Amino acid sequence: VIRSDTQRELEETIRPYDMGITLLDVNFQAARPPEEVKAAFDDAIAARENEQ
Amino acid sequence: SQAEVLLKRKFSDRLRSEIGRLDVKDIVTDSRGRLTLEVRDALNSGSA
């Protein structure tokens, strides 16, 4: 959904400028949390392992 | 390039749906050309 809506918004935004560029494709790469909470997230993963 | 990109997008969406339908054991133990054949004949036709 994020990729589809991003592509739609990007082509709609590009259209008024009337540049020669045609939007071939937009693809999602990563949705990581910020670095300050990366420790909290991977600690949650470690706790999930630590239970077993 | 444009055709390759379109193929990537369509196949990725179809495979994501199919692999979301199944679990890890069904896609790891016994594929036997079942998920892959479904993806192939869903690409060659308008099946969804």
Side-chain angles (χ1 to χ4, degrees):
Chain A
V1 58
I2 302 304
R3 164 265 171 184
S4 171
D5 281 354
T6 296
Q7 189 191 21
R8 188 155 39 83
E9 299 298 320
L10 174 59
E11 61 164 342
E12 287 184 355
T13 290
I14 289 304
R15 187 193 322 297
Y17 308 156
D18 195 7
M19 301 166 318
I21 291 168
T22 65
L23 184 63
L24 193 60
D25 171 83
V26 178
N27 46 3
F28 201 105
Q29 190 165 309
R32 296 198 318 296
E35 281 59 40
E36 296 75 2
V37 299
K38 186 182 288 184
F41 275 76
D42 72 5
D43 193 16
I45 310 303
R48 168 193 289 93
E49 174 207 357
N50 263 319
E51 182 179 1
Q52 285 300 340
Chain B
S1 187
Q2 193 283 359
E4 211 168 39
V5 171
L6 184 58
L7 193 87
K8 183 184 289 294
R9 184 62 38 202
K10 190 158 177 50
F11 160 76
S12 163
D13 298 4
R14 165 67 46 190
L15 178 57
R16 181 172 320 281
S17 177
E18 293 294 329
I19 201 166
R21 284 291 320 310
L22 305 192
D23 53 33
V24 66
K25 177 170 182 307
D26 294 318
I27 67 171
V28 160
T29 62
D30 180 66
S31 173
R32 205 176 194 279
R34 180 177 292 171
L35 183 147
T36 65
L37 187 146
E38 187 67 6
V39 166
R40 158 162 68 90
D41 76 333
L43 283 192
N44 273 353
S45 56
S47 305

XYZ file of all heavy atoms in Angstrom:
792
model
N 0.828 -1.201 0.000
C 0.000 0.000 0.000
C 0.866 1.256 0.000
O 0.567 2.231 -0.701
C -0.983 -0.024 1.186
C -0.245 -0.133 2.513
C -1.874 1.208 1.163
N 1.949 1.256 0.781
C 2.815 2.427 0.837
C 3.451 2.688 -0.519
O 3.480 3.829 -0.987
C 3.873 2.262 1.940
C 3.197 2.038 3.292
C 4.775 3.483 1.999
C 2.231 3.130 3.672
N 3.959 1.645 -1.182
C 4.552 1.823 -2.500
C 3.524 2.325 -3.505
O 3.808 3.243 -4.282
C 5.176 0.503 -2.959
C 5.488 0.412 -4.443
C 4.369 -0.269 -5.219
N 4.564 -0.168 -6.659
C 3.698 -0.608 -7.562
N 2.564 -1.187 -7.206
N 3.978 -0.463 -8.853
N 2.323 1.739 -3.505
C 1.315 2.158 -4.474
C 0.927 3.617 -4.273
O 0.904 4.406 -5.230
C 0.085 1.258 -4.374
O -0.982 1.768 -5.155
N 0.633 4.001 -3.029
C 0.226 5.375 -2.764
C 1.371 6.348 -3.011
O 1.149 7.459 -3.504
C -0.297 5.498 -1.336
C -1.713 4.983 -1.191
O -2.329 4.642 -2.222
O -2.210 4.918 -0.047
N 2.602 5.952 -2.681
C 3.751 6.810 -2.945
C 3.926 7.042 -4.436
O 4.188 8.169 -4.867
C 5.016 6.193 -2.352
O 4.898 6.132 -0.926
C 6.235 7.024 -2.713
N 3.784 5.988 -5.242
C 3.896 6.151 -6.686
C 2.804 7.066 -7.220
O 3.069 7.942 -8.055
C 3.840 4.789 -7.374
C 4.166 4.831 -8.855
C 3.852 3.527 -9.557
O 3.055 2.725 -9.072
N 4.478 3.308 -10.707
N 1.569 6.886 -6.743
C 0.479 7.740 -7.207
C 0.724 9.201 -6.845
O 0.590 10.093 -7.694
C -0.848 7.255 -6.627
C -2.064 7.964 -7.190
C -3.308 7.098 -7.071
N -3.348 6.368 -5.810
C -3.791 6.872 -4.666
N -4.243 8.112 -4.586
N -3.780 6.110 -3.574
N 1.105 9.463 -5.592
C 1.374 10.834 -5.169
C 2.539 11.432 -5.943
O 2.492 12.603 -6.335
C 1.655 10.881 -3.668
C 0.510 10.402 -2.800
C -0.729 11.253 -2.959
O -0.587 12.489 -3.054
O -1.842 10.687 -2.990
N 3.594 10.649 -6.169
C 4.765 11.172 -6.857
C 4.450 11.515 -8.306
O 4.881 12.560 -8.803
C 5.915 10.173 -6.772
C 7.171 10.527 -7.563
C 7.728 11.854 -7.095
C 8.209 9.435 -7.406
N 3.701 10.658 -9.005
C 3.357 10.989 -10.385
C 2.412 12.186 -10.443
O 2.549 13.047 -11.324
C 2.765 9.777 -11.107
C 1.486 9.218 -10.521
C 0.765 8.296 -11.483
O 1.054 8.358 -12.697
O -0.089 7.507 -11.029
N 1.466 12.277 -9.500
C 0.583 13.439 -9.467
C 1.366 14.721 -9.219
O 1.050 15.769 -9.792
C -0.496 13.261 -8.398
C -1.576 12.258 -8.757
C -2.672 12.192 -7.712
O -2.538 12.861 -6.666
O -3.668 11.471 -7.935
N 2.379 14.664 -8.353
C 3.197 15.842 -8.085
C 4.066 16.199 -9.285
O 4.239 17.381 -9.604
C 4.058 15.603 -6.846
O 3.224 15.584 -5.682
C 5.099 16.697 -6.692
N 4.621 15.192 -9.961
C 5.496 15.445 -11.101
C 4.721 16.042 -12.268
O 5.245 16.895 -12.994
C 6.223 14.147 -11.506
C 7.269 13.773 -10.458
C 6.881 14.291 -12.867
C 8.276 14.860 -10.191
N 3.469 15.623 -12.461
C 2.715 16.008 -13.656
C 2.660 17.512 -13.916
O 2.906 17.919 -15.063
C 1.302 15.419 -13.561
C 0.460 15.612 -14.811
C -1.010 15.297 -14.549
N -1.212 14.154 -13.661
C -0.839 12.907 -13.920
N -0.254 12.580 -15.060
N -1.066 11.962 -13.013
N 2.341 18.382 -12.944
C 2.271 19.820 -13.267
C 3.580 20.411 -13.760
O 3.560 21.324 -14.595
C 1.830 20.453 -11.940
C 1.150 19.364 -11.211
C 1.907 18.126 -11.561
N 4.723 19.926 -13.266
C 6.001 20.495 -13.685
C 6.261 20.248 -15.164
O 7.044 20.976 -15.785
C 7.147 19.923 -12.849
C 6.947 20.004 -11.352
C 7.602 19.124 -10.502
C 6.115 20.960 -10.788
C 7.428 19.189 -9.136
C 5.932 21.030 -9.424
C 6.593 20.144 -8.602
O 6.417 20.214 -7.239
N 5.618 19.231 -15.738
C 5.712 18.922 -17.164
C 7.163 18.699 -17.591
O 7.606 19.161 -18.642
C 5.051 20.017 -18.006
C 4.793 19.581 -19.434
O 5.006 18.389 -19.741
O 4.377 20.429 -20.251
N 7.910 17.988 -16.753
C 9.241 17.565 -17.148
C 9.153 16.355 -18.070
O 8.126 15.676 -18.154
C 10.099 17.233 -15.927
C 10.273 18.383 -14.954
S 10.922 17.847 -13.361
C 9.974 16.353 -13.098
N 10.254 16.088 -18.771
C 10.275 14.959 -19.685
C 10.344 13.622 -18.976
O 10.176 12.573 -19.603
N 10.589 13.640 -17.666
C 10.774 12.404 -16.921
C 9.469 11.627 -16.831
O 8.411 12.178 -16.504
C 11.325 12.716 -15.520
C 12.761 13.230 -15.616
C 11.236 11.497 -14.637
C 13.276 13.838 -14.335
N 9.543 10.331 -17.124
C 8.459 9.393 -16.888
C 8.858 8.459 -15.757
O 9.968 7.908 -15.750
C 8.122 8.581 -18.140
O 9.235 7.749 -18.485
C 7.800 9.504 -19.301
N 7.941 8.290 -14.809
C 8.186 7.538 -13.585
C 8.100 6.048 -13.892
O 7.004 5.501 -14.042
C 7.177 7.934 -12.513
C 7.378 7.293 -11.146
C 8.699 7.744 -10.579
C 6.239 7.654 -10.212
N 9.258 5.393 -13.985
C 9.267 3.974 -14.321
C 8.732 3.124 -13.174
O 7.854 2.279 -13.384
C 10.680 3.538 -14.706
C 10.801 2.167 -15.366
C 9.992 2.136 -16.648
C 12.255 1.834 -15.642
N 9.227 3.347 -11.954
C 8.826 2.530 -10.812
C 9.341 3.081 -9.487
O 10.410 3.696 -9.433
C 9.322 1.094 -10.991
C 9.141 0.250 -9.745
O 8.029 -0.281 -9.543
O 10.109 0.117 -8.968
N 8.581 2.859 -8.417
C 9.001 3.142 -7.050
C 8.843 1.860 -6.248
O 7.809 1.191 -6.345
C 8.176 4.282 -6.425
C 8.605 4.523 -4.988
C 8.312 5.549 -7.250
N 9.865 1.507 -5.471
C 9.848 0.272 -4.696
C 10.310 0.530 -3.270
O 11.236 1.314 -3.042
C 10.717 -0.807 -5.351
C 12.063 -0.281 -5.798
O 12.389 0.882 -5.576
N 12.852 -1.137 -6.436
N 9.658 -0.133 -2.320
C 9.993 -0.008 -0.909
C 11.330 -0.679 -0.616
O 11.659 -1.727 -1.175
C 8.891 -0.648 -0.062
C 8.855 -0.175 1.361
C 7.876 0.705 1.778
C 9.774 -0.634 2.288
C 7.826 1.139 3.084
C 9.729 -0.202 3.595
C 8.753 0.685 3.993
N 12.110 -0.062 0.273
C 13.361 -0.663 0.726
C 13.340 -1.017 2.206
O 13.541 -2.184 2.553
C 14.547 0.261 0.428
C 15.892 -0.414 0.646
C 17.043 0.337 0.015
O 16.999 0.689 -1.160
N 18.085 0.588 0.799
N 13.100 -0.054 3.094
C 13.229 -0.325 4.518
C 12.429 0.693 5.315
O 12.323 1.862 4.931
C 14.695 -0.306 4.959
N 11.882 0.229 6.436
C 11.109 1.035 7.372
C 11.671 0.896 8.778
O 10.936 0.662 9.742
C 9.634 0.648 7.344
N 12.987 1.026 8.911
C 13.632 0.847 10.200
C 13.192 1.936 11.177
O 12.859 3.051 10.768
C 15.150 0.882 10.045
C 15.721 -0.243 9.203
C 17.215 -0.415 9.454
N 17.932 0.854 9.546
C 18.064 1.728 8.557
N 17.563 1.498 7.354
N 18.724 2.862 8.779
N 13.158 1.634 12.470
C 12.951 2.679 13.469
C 14.217 3.496 13.653
O 15.304 3.064 13.240
C 12.604 1.886 14.736
C 13.295 0.589 14.553
C 13.267 0.298 13.078
N 14.124 4.682 14.255
C 15.328 5.496 14.463
C 16.323 4.807 15.387
O 15.998 3.858 16.105
C 14.785 6.787 15.087
C 13.451 6.414 15.639
C 12.909 5.375 14.711
N 17.562 5.305 15.354
C 18.656 4.634 16.052
C 18.439 4.617 17.560
O 18.888 3.691 18.247
C 19.987 5.308 15.715
C 20.575 4.915 14.366
C 19.654 5.230 13.205
O 19.021 6.306 13.223
O 19.561 4.400 12.276
N 17.759 5.631 18.097
C 17.598 5.726 19.544
C 16.714 4.607 20.084
O 16.853 4.204 21.244
C 17.031 7.095 19.923
C 17.946 8.271 19.593
C 17.977 8.612 18.114
O 17.255 7.958 17.332
O 18.724 9.536 17.733
N 15.798 4.092 19.261
C 14.923 3.002 19.676
C 15.317 1.670 19.056
O 14.661 0.650 19.320
C 13.452 3.328 19.358
C 13.021 4.571 20.109
C 13.266 3.517 17.871
N 16.370 1.645 18.236
C 16.856 0.380 17.698
C 17.311 -0.548 18.815
O 17.085 -1.765 18.754
C 17.996 0.634 16.712
C 18.482 -0.606 15.988
C 19.647 -0.285 15.067
C 19.187 0.510 13.857
N 20.301 0.760 12.902
N 17.959 0.010 19.841
C 18.356 -0.792 20.992
C 17.140 -1.375 21.700
O 17.144 -2.544 22.090
C 19.189 0.049 21.956
N 16.081 -0.581 21.858
C 14.872 -1.100 22.488
C 14.266 -2.234 21.670
O 13.868 -3.267 22.222
C 13.862 0.027 22.682
N 14.211 -2.071 20.347
C 13.601 -3.099 19.506
C 14.410 -4.394 19.518
O 13.850 -5.489 19.692
C 13.432 -2.580 18.079
C 12.171 -1.791 17.867
C 12.064 -0.491 18.328
C 11.091 -2.353 17.210
C 10.906 0.234 18.136
C 9.930 -1.632 17.016
C 9.837 -0.337 17.480
N 15.730 -4.302 19.345
C 16.510 -5.534 19.315
C 16.617 -6.146 20.709
O 16.790 -7.361 20.843
C 17.882 -5.298 18.666
C 18.843 -4.492 19.527
O 18.527 -4.158 20.681
O 19.944 -4.180 19.026
N 16.458 -5.334 21.760
C 16.357 -5.891 23.102
C 15.047 -6.642 23.286
O 15.000 -7.658 23.986
C 16.492 -4.783 24.145
C 16.712 -5.325 25.543
O 17.068 -6.515 25.670
O 16.530 -4.562 26.513
N 13.967 -6.157 22.670
C 12.719 -6.915 22.686
C 12.888 -8.258 21.984
O 12.401 -9.290 22.465
C 11.598 -6.106 22.036
N 13.585 -8.261 20.845
C 13.864 -9.523 20.155
C 14.686 -10.451 21.048
O 14.407 -11.657 21.158
C 14.578 -9.259 18.817
C 13.837 -8.199 17.998
C 14.713 -10.549 18.028
C 12.393 -8.531 17.718
N 15.716 -9.902 21.695
C 16.564 -10.702 22.568
C 15.773 -11.273 23.736
O 16.016 -12.405 24.159
C 17.738 -9.864 23.070
N 14.826 -10.504 24.276
C 13.987 -11.009 25.359
C 13.074 -12.128 24.874
O 12.838 -13.110 25.594
C 13.168 -9.872 25.963
N 12.539 -11.993 23.657
C 11.727 -13.070 23.100
C 12.532 -14.358 22.992
O 12.021 -15.446 23.282
C 11.167 -12.668 21.737
C 10.552 -13.827 20.968
C 10.298 -13.492 19.503
N 9.210 -12.539 19.327
C 9.362 -11.223 19.252
N 10.556 -10.661 19.318
N 8.287 -10.454 19.101
N 13.795 -14.255 22.574
C 14.657 -15.439 22.566
C 14.962 -15.920 23.985
O 15.024 -17.132 24.249
C 15.950 -15.138 21.810
C 16.981 -16.250 21.872
C 18.399 -15.736 21.731
O 18.574 -14.515 21.535
O 19.339 -16.553 21.816
N 15.154 -14.980 24.913
C 15.569 -15.327 26.267
C 14.479 -16.088 27.005
O 14.768 -16.855 27.928
C 15.950 -14.062 27.033
C 17.441 -13.809 27.032
O 18.239 -14.735 27.173
N 17.828 -12.550 26.869
N 13.219 -15.875 26.629
C 12.143 -16.674 27.214
C 12.363 -18.167 26.968
O 12.373 -18.977 27.911
C 10.801 -16.229 26.636
C 9.599 -16.956 27.204
C 8.292 -16.457 26.624
O 8.331 -15.560 25.757
O 7.227 -16.962 27.033
N 12.565 -18.543 25.703
C 12.820 -19.941 25.380
C 14.135 -20.404 25.987
O 14.270 -21.569 26.382
C 12.830 -20.132 23.865
C 11.453 -20.107 23.219
C 10.529 -21.191 23.740
O 10.973 -22.187 24.312
N 9.231 -20.998 23.545
N 13.936 -2.915 -20.332
C 13.908 -2.517 -18.930
C 12.498 -2.299 -18.394
O 12.187 -2.731 -17.280
C 14.738 -1.248 -18.731
O 14.849 -0.927 -17.357
N 11.640 -1.625 -19.163
C 10.279 -1.377 -18.698
C 9.522 -2.686 -18.511
O 8.821 -2.875 -17.506
C 9.562 -0.444 -19.682
C 8.237 0.180 -19.211
C 7.032 -0.754 -19.243
O 7.126 -1.915 -19.631
N 5.882 -0.232 -18.832
N 9.657 -3.607 -19.468
C 8.997 -4.902 -19.353
C 9.538 -5.689 -18.168
O 8.776 -6.347 -17.450
C 9.169 -5.690 -20.649
N 10.853 -5.634 -17.950
C 11.447 -6.324 -16.812
C 10.920 -5.767 -15.496
O 10.628 -6.524 -14.565
C 12.969 -6.210 -16.871
C 13.709 -7.395 -16.282
C 15.184 -7.382 -16.626
O 15.784 -6.287 -16.626
O 15.744 -8.464 -16.902
N 10.793 -4.444 -15.402
C 10.283 -3.826 -14.181
C 8.830 -4.222 -13.945
O 8.426 -4.525 -12.815
C 10.448 -2.298 -14.246
C 9.719 -1.651 -13.096
C 11.919 -1.928 -14.209
N 8.018 -4.212 -15.005
C 6.623 -4.613 -14.855
C 6.515 -6.071 -14.422
O 5.681 -6.419 -13.572
C 5.865 -4.378 -16.160
C 4.367 -4.676 -16.102
C 3.702 -3.826 -15.034
C 3.720 -4.432 -17.453
N 7.354 -6.937 -14.996
C 7.381 -8.336 -14.581
C 7.772 -8.465 -13.118
O 7.160 -9.237 -12.370
C 8.346 -9.120 -15.469
C 8.288 -10.644 -15.383
C 7.243 -11.198 -16.334
C 9.653 -11.237 -15.679
N 8.788 -7.712 -12.692
C 9.193 -7.729 -11.292
C 8.030 -7.358 -10.390
O 7.747 -8.051 -9.409
C 10.358 -6.767 -11.066
C 10.888 -6.770 -9.644
C 11.979 -5.731 -9.463
C 13.250 -6.135 -10.189
N 13.862 -7.354 -9.593
N 7.335 -6.270 -10.719
C 6.251 -5.807 -9.860
C 5.124 -6.829 -9.785
O 4.666 -7.183 -8.687
C 5.723 -4.462 -10.356
C 4.652 -3.867 -9.466
C 5.194 -3.594 -8.074
N 6.569 -3.111 -8.107
C 7.416 -3.195 -7.091
N 7.061 -3.740 -5.939
N 8.651 -2.723 -7.234
N 4.667 -7.320 -10.939
C 3.548 -8.258 -10.936
C 3.910 -9.551 -10.215
O 3.135 -10.043 -9.382
C 3.100 -8.545 -12.367
C 1.792 -9.309 -12.454
C 1.123 -9.113 -13.802
C -0.152 -9.931 -13.907
N -1.045 -9.720 -12.736
N 5.087 -10.110 -10.512
C 5.494 -11.350 -9.864
C 5.682 -11.156 -8.369
O 5.323 -12.034 -7.581
C 6.780 -11.879 -10.489
C 7.524 -12.840 -9.608
C 7.083 -14.141 -9.461
C 8.660 -12.443 -8.926
C 7.761 -15.028 -8.653
C 9.342 -13.328 -8.118
C 8.892 -14.623 -7.984
N 6.267 -10.029 -7.957
C 6.469 -9.785 -6.537
C 5.141 -9.698 -5.804
O 4.987 -10.271 -4.722
C 7.283 -8.510 -6.334
O 7.171 -8.046 -5.001
N 4.162 -8.999 -6.384
C 2.854 -8.919 -5.738
C 2.197 -10.292 -5.643
O 1.676 -10.672 -4.582
C 1.957 -7.941 -6.495
C 2.516 -6.532 -6.508
O 3.639 -6.335 -6.000
O 1.835 -5.623 -7.027
N 2.224 -11.059 -6.737
C 1.589 -12.374 -6.728
C 2.262 -13.302 -5.724
O 1.591 -14.006 -4.959
C 1.621 -12.977 -8.131
C 1.324 -14.462 -8.173
C -0.113 -14.739 -7.777
N -1.041 -13.838 -8.447
C -2.329 -13.737 -8.151
N -2.878 -14.468 -7.195
N -3.084 -12.879 -8.830
N 3.597 -13.309 -5.707
C 4.332 -14.148 -4.772
C 4.098 -13.720 -3.333
O 4.003 -14.575 -2.448
C 5.826 -14.112 -5.095
C 6.735 -14.903 -4.154
C 6.303 -16.355 -4.095
C 8.187 -14.793 -4.580
N 4.014 -12.414 -3.074
C 3.728 -11.948 -1.723
C 2.367 -12.445 -1.259
O 2.224 -12.933 -0.132
C 3.794 -10.423 -1.671
C 3.536 -9.840 -0.296
C 3.812 -8.348 -0.279
N 4.997 -8.003 -1.056
C 6.242 -8.151 -0.628
N 6.508 -8.633 0.574
N 7.248 -7.804 -1.427
N 1.358 -12.354 -2.127
C 0.039 -12.867 -1.765
C 0.090 -14.367 -1.489
O -0.423 -14.845 -0.465
C -0.966 -12.555 -2.873
O -2.238 -13.101 -2.572
N 0.730 -15.125 -2.382
C 0.761 -16.578 -2.242
C 1.488 -16.997 -0.969
O 1.019 -17.868 -0.228
C 1.417 -17.208 -3.471
C 0.612 -17.054 -4.748
C -0.700 -17.811 -4.703
O -0.757 -18.866 -4.038
O -1.674 -17.351 -5.335
N 2.642 -16.385 -0.699
C 3.414 -16.720 0.491
C 2.763 -16.212 1.766
O 3.022 -16.762 2.841
C 4.851 -16.175 0.360
C 5.798 -16.914 1.304
C 4.886 -14.690 0.639
C 7.256 -16.673 0.999
N 1.924 -15.177 1.682
C 1.121 -14.806 2.829
C 0.003 -15.786 3.091
O -0.426 -15.948 4.237
N -0.483 -16.455 2.042
C -1.505 -17.477 2.242
C -0.962 -18.689 2.993
O -1.702 -19.324 3.753
C -2.090 -17.908 0.899
C -3.064 -16.905 0.300
C -4.373 -16.808 1.097
N -4.913 -18.068 1.607
C -5.101 -19.182 0.906
N -4.881 -19.231 -0.397
N -5.549 -20.268 1.527
N 0.311 -19.023 2.804
C 0.904 -20.234 3.356
C 1.840 -19.904 4.512
O 2.195 -18.747 4.754
C 1.662 -21.008 2.272
C 0.884 -21.379 1.010
C 1.668 -22.380 0.179
C -0.486 -21.932 1.361
N 2.241 -20.949 5.231
C 3.187 -20.835 6.331
C 4.571 -21.312 5.897
O 4.801 -21.672 4.741
C 2.696 -21.623 7.551
C 2.363 -23.070 7.226
O 3.025 -23.668 6.354
O 1.428 -23.612 7.851
N 5.500 -21.318 6.856
C 6.889 -21.649 6.540
C 7.033 -23.127 6.192
O 7.791 -23.492 5.285
C 7.818 -21.231 7.699
C 7.544 -22.047 8.953
C 9.273 -21.368 7.285
N 6.310 -24.000 6.895
C 6.481 -25.433 6.675
C 5.990 -25.847 5.294
O 6.627 -26.666 4.622
C 5.755 -26.225 7.762
C 5.815 -27.729 7.566
C 5.306 -28.469 8.789
C 5.423 -29.971 8.603
N 4.782 -30.423 7.337
N 4.860 -25.293 4.850
C 4.327 -25.666 3.545
C 5.208 -25.163 2.409
O 5.307 -25.821 1.367
C 2.902 -25.139 3.383
C 1.928 -25.788 4.345
O 2.014 -27.019 4.535
O 1.073 -25.071 4.903
N 5.849 -24.006 2.581
C 6.700 -23.466 1.528
C 8.131 -23.987 1.596
O 8.888 -23.809 0.633
C 6.719 -21.928 1.565
C 7.402 -21.431 2.837
C 5.307 -21.378 1.472
C 7.653 -19.944 2.850
N 8.524 -24.616 2.697
C 9.874 -25.149 2.851
C 9.923 -26.643 2.573
O 10.744 -27.106 1.781
C 10.422 -24.823 4.259
C 11.570 -25.752 4.608
C 10.876 -23.376 4.328
N 9.047 -27.416 3.215
C 9.134 -28.869 3.111
C 8.746 -29.354 1.721
O 9.562 -29.955 1.013
C 8.252 -29.531 4.170
O 6.882 -29.175 3.945
C 8.668 -29.089 5.564
N 7.502 -29.097 1.304
C 6.972 -29.642 0.062
C 6.474 -28.504 -0.832
O 5.312 -28.103 -0.800
C 5.859 -30.658 0.331
C 5.291 -31.248 -0.946
O 6.028 -31.967 -1.651
O 4.106 -30.989 -1.247
N 7.378 -27.970 -1.655
C 6.948 -27.080 -2.726
C 6.456 -27.886 -3.921
O 5.318 -27.715 -4.374
C 8.091 -26.149 -3.129
O 7.745 -25.384 -4.270
N 7.305 -28.779 -4.438
C 6.928 -29.740 -5.478
C 6.344 -29.042 -6.703
O 5.523 -29.601 -7.434
C 5.954 -30.783 -4.925
C 5.971 -32.112 -5.663
C 5.054 -33.124 -4.997
N 5.292 -34.479 -5.481
C 4.805 -34.966 -6.614
N 4.046 -34.233 -7.413
N 5.087 -36.220 -6.954
N 6.777 -27.808 -6.934
C 6.231 -27.034 -8.037
C 4.746 -26.775 -7.914
O 4.015 -26.882 -8.906
N 4.276 -26.454 -6.709
C 2.882 -26.097 -6.478
C 2.683 -24.595 -6.356
O 1.870 -24.016 -7.083
C 2.361 -26.793 -5.214
C 0.915 -26.473 -4.887
C 0.444 -27.255 -3.675
N 0.363 -28.684 -3.952
C 0.144 -29.613 -3.033
N -0.020 -29.299 -1.758
N 0.090 -30.890 -3.401
N 3.405 -23.950 -5.439
C 3.369 -22.494 -5.362
C 3.924 -21.867 -6.634
O 3.354 -20.905 -7.164
C 4.152 -22.025 -4.134
C 4.200 -20.537 -3.789
C 4.272 -20.363 -2.285
C 5.394 -19.865 -4.445
N 5.036 -22.403 -7.138
C 5.663 -21.851 -8.333
C 4.781 -22.021 -9.564
O 4.676 -21.103 -10.383
C 7.023 -22.506 -8.559
O 6.843 -23.902 -8.832
C 7.898 -22.345 -7.328
N 4.146 -23.185 -9.717
C 3.244 -23.383 -10.845
C 2.038 -22.459 -10.747
O 1.556 -21.942 -11.763
C 2.805 -24.846 -10.917
C 1.982 -25.307 -12.123
C 2.333 -26.743 -12.470
C 0.488 -25.185 -11.855
N 1.527 -22.253 -9.532
C 0.428 -21.316 -9.341
C 0.839 -19.907 -9.749
O 0.099 -19.210 -10.451
C -0.040 -21.344 -7.886
C -1.302 -20.531 -7.608
C -2.547 -21.097 -8.273
O -2.478 -22.193 -8.869
O -3.605 -20.437 -8.199
N 2.034 -19.481 -9.340
C 2.513 -18.158 -9.726
C 2.657 -18.062 -11.240
O 2.258 -17.066 -11.854
C 3.837 -17.840 -9.007
C 4.519 -16.647 -9.650
C 3.585 -17.582 -7.533
N 3.212 -19.101 -11.868
C 3.439 -19.069 -13.308
C 2.129 -18.986 -14.085
O 1.973 -18.124 -14.955
C 4.235 -20.296 -13.750
C 4.064 -20.626 -15.223
C 5.167 -21.534 -15.723
N 5.087 -22.866 -15.141
C 4.401 -23.872 -15.669
N 3.724 -23.729 -16.796
N 4.397 -25.048 -15.051
N 1.172 -19.868 -13.784
C -0.071 -19.847 -14.547
C -1.002 -18.727 -14.101
O -2.010 -18.477 -14.770
C -0.777 -21.207 -14.478
C -1.471 -21.452 -13.154
O -1.047 -20.881 -12.135
O -2.452 -22.225 -13.137
N -0.692 -18.047 -12.993
C -1.408 -16.822 -12.664
C -0.801 -15.628 -13.388
O -1.477 -14.621 -13.621
C -1.403 -16.600 -11.151
N 0.485 -15.712 -13.732
C 1.101 -14.657 -14.530
C 0.667 -14.751 -15.988
O 0.405 -13.733 -16.639
C 2.623 -14.727 -14.418
C 3.239 -14.179 -13.130
C 4.744 -14.049 -13.275
C 2.619 -12.846 -12.766
N 0.583 -15.973 -16.519
C 0.233 -16.155 -17.923
C -1.244 -15.910 -18.195
O -1.647 -15.852 -19.360
C 0.617 -17.563 -18.381
C 2.050 -17.645 -18.860
O 2.736 -16.629 -18.974
N 2.512 -18.857 -19.142
N -2.059 -15.773 -17.153
C -3.480 -15.510 -17.316
C -3.885 -14.375 -16.389
O -3.071 -13.841 -15.634
C -4.323 -16.758 -17.029
O -4.047 -17.270 -15.738
N -5.153 -13.990 -16.473
C -5.686 -12.986 -15.574
C -6.340 -13.600 -14.355
O -7.540 -13.416 -14.127
N -5.561 -14.327 -13.560
C -6.067 -15.047 -12.400
C -5.675 -14.302 -11.134
O -4.507 -13.940 -10.957
C -5.528 -16.480 -12.364
O -5.809 -17.160 -13.574
N -6.649 -14.079 -10.258
C -6.409 -13.379 -9.002
C -7.419 -13.805 -7.943
O -7.667 -14.996 -7.752
C -6.464 -11.874 -9.215
